[PDB]
C-alpha cells in the first residue's frame, strides 16, 4: 500500500507510536498509581492487539529508512521470530485483561515491555 519507501516508514512509525501509547498508558494501572477497571483495560488491550499486528507489514523488502536497522532484512526469519514472539506476549496480556486478572496483567505487561526492548536492541538504530 506504499508508493515509496518513505510511505512505509511513515506508516510503521505511526503504528509504533500508537502502540507505545496504548501500552504505556497502562503503566500507572500496573503500578497501582491509577485504579484498575477491568473493562477499561480489556478494551484498551483489544486496541493494542490490533495495533500490535500492524507495523510488520510496513517493513517490506526495500523499505530501509527511518531508524530501522538493515539487519531486519538480512535475516528475515529472525526478525519474523521477534515480531511473532512479541505478538504472542501481547496474547498473554490479552488473556490477562480478558480474565480481569490484575496479577497476570502485571506479569504480562513486564514481559511485553521486555519484548519491545529485545527487538529494539537488535533492530532499532540509536
The binder of a second copy chosen from 5, 42, 54, 98 (CB under 8 A)? 54
| Count of residues that interact with a second copy, criterion CB under 8 A | 16
* Residue 34 touches ligand HEC, criterion: CB under 6 A: no
The binder of ligand HEC chosen from 11, 30, 82, 96 (CB under 6 A)? 82
Q: How far is CA 112 from the centre of its chain?
A: 8
**Least distance (Å) between residue 13 CB and a second copy:** 8
Quick one: what does residue 15 bind among a second copy, ligand HEC, none, with the CB cut-off 5 to 8 Å set by partner type? a second copy
CA distance 93 to 50: 13
DSSP state of 68: B
Q: What is the C-alpha radius of gyration for the chain, rounded to an integer number of angstroms? A: 15
Of 34, 41, 90, 50, which is closest to residue 82 (Cα–Cα)? Answer: 90
Quick one: what does residue 109 bind among a second copy, ligand HEC, none, with the CB cut-off 5 to 8 Å set by partner type? none
* Residue 93 touches ligand HEC, criterion: CB under 6 A: no
CA distance 85 to 83: 5
The grid coordinates listed for 67 are 531508524
Q: Annotated binding residue at 116?
A: yes
* Residue 81 touches a second copy, criterion: CB under 8 A: no
Amino acid at each position: 500500500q506504499f508508493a515509496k519507501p518513505e510511505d512505509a516508514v511513515k506508516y510503521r512509525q505511526s503504528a509504533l507510536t500508537l502502540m507505545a501509547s496504548h501500552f504505556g498508558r497502562m503503566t500507572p494501572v500496573v503500578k497501582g498509581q491509577a485504579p484498575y477497571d477491568a473493562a477499561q483495560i480489556k478494551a484498551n488491550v483489544e486496541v493494542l492487539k490490533t495495533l500490535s499486528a500492524l507495523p510488520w507489514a510496513a517493513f517490506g523488502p526495500g523499505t530501509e529508512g527511518g531508524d530501522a536497522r538493515p539487519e531486519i532484512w538480512s535475516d528475515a526469519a529472525s526478525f519474523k521470530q521477534k515480531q511473532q514472539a512479541f505478538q504472542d506476549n501481547i496474547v498473554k496480556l490479552s488473556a490477562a485483561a480478558d480474565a480481569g486478572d490484575l496479577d497476570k496483567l502485571r506479569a504480562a505487561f513486564g514481559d511485553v515491555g521486555a519484548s519491545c526492548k529485545a527487538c529494539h536492541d537488535a533492530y532499532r538504530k540509536k
